[PDB]
Amino acid sequence: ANNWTDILAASDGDEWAAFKTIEAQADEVRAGHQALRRAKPLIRLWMNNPDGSEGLVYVGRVDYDDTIRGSFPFKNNTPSQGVLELRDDNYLAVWLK
């Protein structure tokens, strides 16, 4: 809770400096939001345990750049189909084949 008086004192009584401080804070919050929005997805394939026990076992990860195309819908109370296209030289594509 940095009050206006506290910010002005930190800026040594310069209103323009204090407002530039506040603007920099707002800009960093906006930049964090933009990075969160533009973050790449994490696509991971898991399998059942070969011995027949519980717990999914990590197969691997598909890179977003290594995908060809993808489409994942979230629907309200309705099943949806996700589609992922890979090159056949991809290691997870080879594993699936």
């Binding site: 940095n2 407002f19 506040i22 707002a26 919050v29």
Partner: protein, 290 residues
């Protein structure tokens, strides 16, 4: 000529004078025939109508500027250094500034590499040490702009009011920004300026909107432009979530200005307000419009 000066300030802070007084001192000059450089591209929309087509609106398009530079030096090694520096001045992810200075002032356009540059002639460039680089840059924000007008009003009273003089001297509407300290409840103007985009031109002539009551430490930035979220608090609190669907809807129309009123209430400390009015233009130079 001495009536126009063109500079590039690269992503790395380098300064190049491509045209005007002192052009080519850094080794790079500007070749003729630069396109989509002066007027902001706009496409107009038309619906079918009884007499042909009816006007439906306008949309401003991003700038796709194709221009050539000429990098030169007496010796090929220094030419190579100059060419490398020019290449380092540009990027795809981050934008570099392109400043045009005339008797109307200095206006800048932020441009980034749209695609890979096309350098050199058909032979190797060390033969000549004087080679052209074709650059296809793009301006996502297509308006030439100047430094915005900033005003500050601080107070110690619990309840107070002020008037900010505002005036759009450009040819395109601009979107205002506010910086509001906390705690306090602010009433901010959203005057229509007679604009009829929502069919509320003179209905919203004196529209004022109440920001949500800011708690201690929740200094907010209120940006009316559509590129960015309106309310952002510096402490990360979701101020807009408490702002029940309200928004700033109107930009400052060209040729319009007034003393817009700002009200502060319920501020035990007494807060501060800052208003930022952008100076957007559709042309690198233009006489002021009244």
């Amino acid at each position: 000529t001495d009536f126009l000066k063109i500079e590039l300030i690269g992503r790395d802070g380098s300064h190049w004078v491509l045209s005007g007084p002192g052009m080519g001192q850094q080794g790079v000059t500007l070749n003729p025939n630069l396109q989509q450089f002066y007027d902001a591209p706009v496409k107009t929309l038309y619906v079918p109508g009884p007499f042909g087509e009816e006007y439906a609106g306008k949309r401003v398009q991003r700038r796709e500027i194709v221009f050539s530079v000429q990098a030169y030096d007496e010796d090929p090694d220094t030419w190579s250094t100059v060419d490398s520096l020019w290449r380092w001045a540009w990027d795809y992810d981050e934008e570099s500034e392109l400043r045009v200075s005339t008797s109307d002032g200095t206006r800048f356009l932020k441009v980034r590499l749209m695609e890979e540059p096309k350098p050199y002639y058909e032979k190797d460039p060390h033969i000549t040490a004087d080679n052209p680089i074709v650059m296809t840059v793009t301006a996502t924000f297509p308006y030439w702009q100047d430094e915005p007008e900033e005003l500050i009003w601080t107070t110690l009273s619990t309840e107070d009011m002020t008037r900010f003089p505002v005036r759009n001297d450009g040819d395109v509407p601009v979107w205002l920004k506010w910086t509001l300290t906390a705690p306090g409840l602010w009433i901010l103007p959203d005057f229509s300026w007679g604009n009829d985009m929502y069919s509320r031109g003179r209905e919203d002539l004196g529209r004022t909107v109440a920001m949500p009551e800011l708690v201690a430490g929740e200094h907010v930035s209120v940006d009316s432009d559509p590129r960015v979220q309106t309310l952002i608090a510096v402490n990360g609190m979701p101020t807009q979530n408490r702002w029940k669907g309200n928004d700033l809807l109107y930009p400052l129309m060209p040729g319009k200005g007034a003393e817009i009123p700002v009200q502060l209430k319920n501020a035990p400390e007494g807060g501060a307000c800052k208003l930022t009015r952008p100076r957007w233009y559709s042309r690198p130079w233009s006489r002021p419009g009244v």
